[PDB]
């Protein structure tokens, strides 16, 4: 929910500006053994509720892989590349999932966020995330999910002239 992403006043927050009306988005996730996920989500404000509505579809993860053998521990934080296209904020990310002992397993990430209303569009910028299972039963039947997201620019001086 990119709503819950702190925007410094320099950047336009594409997200909180899309409400009241809302915003929908669309993502694909390609794993490095080519398991693949397609997903969709609608975000409707009512009262103070953002009722997220989601269809999620995942494909051809290999039998002895990490997903099917449950050897992920988390996602590494990541940094999303945000870039206005055809009027649409598209986001791009190299995600990775830490494994039991053994290092990482990588994934690409394309998200486009579409506004239900006319909002002010930002220049190119990045949202640092970090997403995390705070807690879970042994089955994951009940899982407490946290997320931290912060939109920035570049910390570095365009020292150009």
């Amino acid at each position: 929910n990119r709503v819950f992403t702190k925007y410094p006043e320099d950047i336009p927050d594409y997200f909180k500006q899309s409400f009241p009306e809302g915003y929908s988005w669309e993502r694909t996730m390609t794993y490095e053994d080519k398991g693949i996920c397609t997903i969709r989500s609608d975000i409707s404000l009512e009262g103070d509720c953002f009722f997220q509505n989601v269809r999620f579809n995942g494909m051809n993860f290999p039998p002895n892989g990490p997903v099917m053998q449950k050897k992920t521990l988390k996602w590494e934080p990541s940094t999303e590349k945000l870039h206005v296209r055809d009027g649409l904020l598209v986001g791009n990310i190299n995600m990775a999932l830490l494994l039991e002992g053994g290092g990482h397993y990588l994934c690409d990430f394309k998200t486009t966020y579409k506004a239900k209303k006319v909002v002010q569009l930002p220049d190119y910028h990045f949202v640092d995330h970090r997403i995390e299972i705070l807690s879970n039963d042994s089955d994951y039947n009940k899982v407490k999910l946290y997320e931290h997201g912060v939109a920035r620019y570049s910390p570095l001086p365009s020292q150009a002239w």
Partner: protein, 59 residues
């Protein structure tokens, strides 16, 4: 319109590797302070025979 405390509820139908599942959650956080918390229930398809991380930036 959006306030330092808001509330969240989330519904997810799913297929992964043939295997179906539904999942519901309700939660909270601070939009201007860009942090979010959420409580998730697998309403159908349990137990999920695949890692849960690959669902979570969707949830």
């Amino acid at each position: 319109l959006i306030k330092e405390d808001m509330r969240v509820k989330v519904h997810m139908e799913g297929n992964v590797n043939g295997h179906a599942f539904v999942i519901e959650g309700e939660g909270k956080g601070k939009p201007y302070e860009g942090t979010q918390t959420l409580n998730l229930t697998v309403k159908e398809g349990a137990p999920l025979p695949f890692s849960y991380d690959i669902l979570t930036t969707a949830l």
